[PDB]
Design a protein around this ligand. Structure first.
Ligand SMILES: [Mg+2]
Ligand SMILES: [Mg+2]
Ligand SMILES: [Mg+2]
Ligand SMILES: [Mg+2]
Ligand SMILES: [Mg+2]
Ligand SMILES: [Mg+2]
Ligand SMILES: [Mg+2]
Ligand SMILES: [Mg+2]
Ligand SMILES: [Mg+2]
Ligand SMILES: [Mg+2]
Ligand SMILES: [Mg+2]
Ligand SMILES: [Mg+2]
Ligand SMILES: [Mg+2]
Ligand SMILES: [Mg+2]
Ligand SMILES: [Mg+2]
Ligand SMILES: [Mg+2]
Ligand SMILES: [Mg+2]
Ligand SMILES: [Mg+2]
Ligand SMILES: [Mg+2]
Ligand SMILES: [Mg+2]
Ligand SMILES: [Mg+2]
Ligand SMILES: [Mg+2]
Ligand SMILES: [Mg+2]
Ligand SMILES: [Mg+2]
Ligand SMILES: [Mg+2]
Ligand SMILES: [Mg+2]
Ligand SMILES: [Mg+2]
Ligand SMILES: [Mg+2]
Ligand SMILES: [Mg+2]
Ligand SMILES: [Mg+2]
Ligand SMILES: [Mg+2]
Ligand SMILES: [Mg+2]
Ligand SMILES: [Mg+2]
Ligand SMILES: [Mg+2]
Ligand SMILES: [Mg+2]
Ligand SMILES: [Mg+2]
Ligand SMILES: [Mg+2]
Ligand SMILES: [Mg+2]
Ligand SMILES: [Mg+2]
Ligand SMILES: [Mg+2]
Ligand SMILES: [Mg+2]
Ligand SMILES: [Mg+2]
Lengths: 148, 156, 185, 127
RNA sequence: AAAUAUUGGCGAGAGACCGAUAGCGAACAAGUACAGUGAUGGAAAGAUGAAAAGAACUUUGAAAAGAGAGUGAAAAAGUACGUGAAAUUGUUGAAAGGGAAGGGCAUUUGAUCAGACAGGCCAGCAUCAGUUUUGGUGGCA
RNA sequence: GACGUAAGUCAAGGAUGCUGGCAUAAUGGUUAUAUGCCGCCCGUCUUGAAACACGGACCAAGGAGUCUAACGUCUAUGCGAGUGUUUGGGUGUAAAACCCAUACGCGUAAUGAAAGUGAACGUAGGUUGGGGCCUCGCAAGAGGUGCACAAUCGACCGAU
RNA sequence: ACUAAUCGAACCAUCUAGUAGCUGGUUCCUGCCGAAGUUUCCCUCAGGAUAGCAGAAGCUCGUAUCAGUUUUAUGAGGUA
RNA sequence: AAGCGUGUUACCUAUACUCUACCGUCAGGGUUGAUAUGAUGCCCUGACGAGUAGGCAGGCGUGGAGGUCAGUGACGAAGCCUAGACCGUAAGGUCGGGUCGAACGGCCUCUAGUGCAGAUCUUGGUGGUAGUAGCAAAUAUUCAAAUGAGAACUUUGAAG
């Protein structure tokens, strides 16, 4: 909606809000990131430190599918059970009939330990797990199975 | 429609006036204005005429009869702010003036009631005017400002 | 001439009305404008101001956050008031039976409260059963957890988050960020 | 007659004509603010034209009223004229410029039947 | 082979597009008229009226044409044609004018103009209220 | 508030009463002129413009912060630990409207150059404030609880 | 010097709406607030970034924290 | 002294100060068991008002789009002219009269190729200058008749 812009409001005023001294010009400081080491150095060091220079080692032909391992914290583990069956599993926290949670199907690689699952045994299947996450699972009476 | 409508309209109910604290108290005339003083008429068809002040009417006017037999000014009203009260005096306790009020001078040739009243009123007036000399001539003469007359330092 | 100590014709800087044209919110403001004026309870004046707040100034209040406010001693029977959205939380497993008054409940939040025996209430139903805010509890969400706040006051040695589109190695982890490359922040 | 009103005060009856619109033909009289750096009118030098200011705004109790004391309502037809049936002391009707001559007699005859003052009753009138 | 592209060609349907200084350079005998040795460059230019019904005829003039008459709803539509602004111009009328003119505030004069008797315009006096100004006189320290 | 024995009255939270002339160009408006005083040509750059600085003989029409990709802050809206139908498919009154699967993007985890590892001692901590609410109080106030947020000291995760 | 009125590098079309820290212009009204020509860095001195000054949006609260001022007490200074 | 030094009074007058009104802005408040139906309304109270660059707000106008006024119009739309009238501080809106001949408005919203005095701006048109500068190199013309409305300039004859 061009009727709501300051351009409509600047009609009748000589400089269009750009100043009589500055005189809005083409590119007074350069184009793009011009002079980021010379005359834009203060801004760059203040707001984008680390911009210039190298760090670390290269990776020729990096495929991000190799580094696919989405993380599921323990406090969200029970969300992988459907809402309806979730309540009937928390009730009757059994050992001979404990839910199997295959977290790979849900789309996770590793299971982390943000913690405080209820004391209900669960058979948690995953590719990877942290040390704290399994010990909280086994504290509740469950077990971790490794899958591929 | 050329105009849509006023979204709501002002109410045409007229508001009553607030109670006013303005009581009508009687006028206090200037000290120089006592009945019997000779007045100079400052404005009107009788400009500059010397008249006799007889009564203060209830509408804040002065009832004058600059004796009609003398200078031809009848029983009439004048404004106290359009007269100059001189120092000359005549006696008034010989003329009856209760008959004259606001309704007397109400509008609605010359009525015979007014003509006969003038004869009664001036009959006692001219009798007392003859007492001291030169009033009749003074009342017939008309006042005017001469060259070198400064009313701010003149006395009447 | 007058030697002005303060700026002349300065607006207060506080919202006197909601920015929204929500018709239903405008007559929640109308109800609580009346209650604020005709009742001396400080609760009504607080609620009226909170109804003007923008979206970032009324962050969502979780049911887990509600459950924690009800664990204060003597606060388990109060009515929780949220002037904003009440969202759900799967981290909390046991939710108490309580009354919550809010502008909005998400579908997950409404189910959790009702299932635990409580009731979800609007701010007009609160006003009819707490005309002076009897035994209520005003909860506000975390205002400074917003992602835009990470970049506020960016500068050397400030520890703030740079405004950056892509993240990783080769992206502002070099000269200025470590001693081995010039200096460190 | 309309409702009683305070004596209408204008505070400025002279038209606010643009600076130098009496000097060049290309400058219309429609008011424009002088925005030049050296403009005497902008700088309010003595002896120059006045500029519209909010201080000239009319009293709210007499604003929009014509000297008849009515507010002008522009009317295109009889149905529009009816909106002022209960507002004859506050609003006077004006017939729109583009109403045909035969339609103006219908409006004028209806206006008399209800007491609405018409502010241009002589327009397009056959005599 | 298809799914892909398509400011060219052919045929279609459309638009919150432009509306004759716009929209293609070109709404029209436009890549025309015209300029350049040449490569090239390159316009301006739409609208009488429903219908020419495009003014027979008379008169003045060498004629162009004018004045009539007429056609037409209109000639305040006459192919110099829809409307017909401004700059600029003629006539008439009004006014002012000792080396500019034009402007602001106020009023005189002239011209012109709107509205209202079921109170409108302009005033005078008295008693008060608010704010002031200028005198007279009294009692005290 | 005053005066008055009351009744009431008053100059006490803002003007009333009486009277006259006219009822139209009379007042008023507009406009032209005259008179008194005042008034240098706009725009622009500039410390400074009426400038012996620059553009402007006049008039009409045209004539200059736009659109797009990506993004910051703020605001509105929908939903909300999720969210985004419109690449596609279905459908259609056919470039509309309506409906939808699987993905994908961003968010829900950080940190390290990386291999990697990966977030509760505790009522998800202690102290100091802190609106609101609760209790006792006519009230002042005292006590309890204290969300957001602010400071600080801790705990936890990655790196060293 | 001349090379079609063109010569210290012809003319024509295109790239091309070439770039310009430089010059000119930048079109309606009213209301409210309202500056800077100084700090640091820059092949920087007719330009930028930076801090400052300004507006807007507000937010948490509700008379505190305060203050281009004084007083009392207690320090510092090396100008007249 | 109508000069100089000094002293005492009176007087003059700024957009300054006091008081009042009115406009706007800001702030603090009142107002719901019909608020005598409009709560972004009505109202009470106090203070304040300079402004370039610049910011923000509220409005005015233009082309076109969705909706509505079963809106205006060949009994006259639009446009144009109008020292005629009215409303608005203003941008502007409205009305009367003249010309004209076919379409065009109000309001709620959407949209933008949306507002001109300048750019030695573009195109077009038009002025003052001004009936002015000028129409002066190349020796040179003249008389009569004819033609013709009209002959310095055509034709013929005669001369030079
Ligand atoms: Mg400029
Ligand atoms: Mg006006
Ligand atoms: Mg004006
Ligand atoms: Mg200046
Ligand atoms: Mg063209
Ligand atoms: Mg034409
Ligand atoms: Mg015609
Ligand atoms: Mg015509
Ligand atoms: Mg015609
Ligand atoms: Mg024509
Ligand atoms: Mg003209
Ligand atoms: Mg003058
Ligand atoms: Mg007085
Ligand atoms: Mg006059
Ligand atoms: Mg002068
Ligand atoms: Mg200089
Ligand atoms: Mg200048
Ligand atoms: Mg020069
Ligand atoms: Mg220059
Ligand atoms: Mg020039
Ligand atoms: Mg234009
Ligand atoms: Mg660690
Ligand atoms: Mg050559
Ligand atoms: Mg170029
Ligand atoms: Mg200011
Ligand atoms: Mg260098
Ligand atoms: Mg310069
Ligand atoms: Mg500031
Ligand atoms: Mg020393
Ligand atoms: Mg020293
Ligand atoms: Mg002396
Ligand atoms: Mg101002
Ligand atoms: Mg400005
Ligand atoms: Mg119709
Ligand atoms: Mg017309
Ligand atoms: Mg004119
Ligand atoms: Mg036609
Ligand atoms: Mg444009
Ligand atoms: Mg122009
Ligand atoms: Mg300009
Ligand atoms: Mg020019
Ligand atoms: Mg000559």
């Amino acid at each position: 909606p061009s009727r709501f812009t300051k351009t409509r409001k600047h009609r009748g005023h000589v400089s269009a809000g750009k100043g009589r001294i500055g005189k809005h010009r083409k590119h007074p400081g350069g184009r793009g990131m011009a002079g980021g080491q010379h005359h834009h150095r203060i801004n760059m060091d203040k707001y984008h430190p680390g911009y210039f220079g190298k760090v670390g080692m290269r990776y020729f032909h990096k495929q991000q599918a190799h580094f696919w391992k989405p993380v599921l914290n323990l406090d969200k583990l029970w969300t992988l059970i459907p809402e309806d069956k979730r309540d009937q599993y928390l009730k009757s926290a059994s050992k001979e009939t404990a839910p199997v949670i295959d977290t790979l199907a849900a789309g996770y690689g590793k299971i982390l330990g943000k913690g405080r699952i209820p004391n209900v045994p669960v058979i948690v299947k995953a590719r990877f797990v942290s040390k704290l996450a399994e010990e909280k699972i086994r504290a509740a009476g469950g077990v971790v199975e490794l899958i591929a | 429609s050329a105009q849509k409508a006023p979204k709501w309209y002002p109410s045409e109910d007229v508001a009553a006036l607030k109670k006013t604290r303005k009581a009508a108290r009687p006028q206090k005339l200037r000290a120089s204005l006592v009945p019997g003083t000779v007045l100079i008429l400052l404005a009107g068809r009788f400009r500059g005429k010397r008249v006799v002040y007889l009564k203060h009417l209830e509408d804040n006017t002065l009832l004058i009869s600059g004796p009609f037999k003398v200078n031809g000014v009848p029983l009439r009203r004048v404004n106290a702010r359009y007269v100059i009260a001189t120092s000359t005096k005549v006696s008034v306790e010989g003329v009856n003036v209760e008959k004259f009020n606001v309704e007397y001078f109400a509008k609605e040739e010359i009525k015979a009631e007014r003509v006969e009243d003038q004869k009664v009123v001036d009959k006692a007036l001219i009798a007392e005017i003859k007492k001291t000399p030169l009033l009749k001539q003074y009342l017939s003469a008309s006042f005017s400002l001469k060259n070198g007359d400064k009313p701010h330092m003149l006395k009447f | 001439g007058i030697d002005h100590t303060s700026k002349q014709h300065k607006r207060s800087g506080h919202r006197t009305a909601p920015k929204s044209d929500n018709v239903y919110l405008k007559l929640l403001v109308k109800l609580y404008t009346f209650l604020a004026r005709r009742t001396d309870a400080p609760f009504n004046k607080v609620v009226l101001k909170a109804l003007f707040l923008s979206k970032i100034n009324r962050p969502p209040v979780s049911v887990s956050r509600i459950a924690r406010a009800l664990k204060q001693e003597g606060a388990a029977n109060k009515t929780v008031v949220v002037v904003g959205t009440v969202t759900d939380d799967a981290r909390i497993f046991e939710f108490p039976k309580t009354t919550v008054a809010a502008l909005r409940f998400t579908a997950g939040a409404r189910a959790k409260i009702v299932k635990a025996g409580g009731e979800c209430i609007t701010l007009d139903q609160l006003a009819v059963r707490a005309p002076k805010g009897q035994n209520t509890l005003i909860l506000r969400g975390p205002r400074n957890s917003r992602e835009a706040v990470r970049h506020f006051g960016m500068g050397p040695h400030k520890g703030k988050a740079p405004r950056i589109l892509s993240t990783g190695r080769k992206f502002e982890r070099a000269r200025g960020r470590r001693r081995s490359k010039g200096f460190k922040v | 007659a309309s409702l009683p009103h305070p004596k209408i005060v204008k505070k400025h009856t002279k038209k606010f004509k643009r600076h130098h619109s009496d000097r060049y033909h290309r400058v219309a009289e429609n008011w424009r603010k002088q925005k030049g750096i050296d403009s005497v009118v902008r700088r309010r030098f003595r002896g120059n034209i006045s500029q519209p200011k909010i201080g000239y705004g009319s009293n709210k109790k007499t604003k929009f009223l014509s000297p008849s004391g009515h507010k002008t309502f522009l009317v295109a037809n009889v149905k529009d004229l009816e909106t002022l049936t209960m507002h004859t002391k506050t609003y006077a009707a004006e017939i729109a410029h583009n109403i045909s001559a035969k339609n103006r007699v219908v409006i004028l005859a209806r206006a008399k039947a209800l007491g609405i003052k018409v502010t241009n009753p002589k327009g397009r009138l056959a005599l």
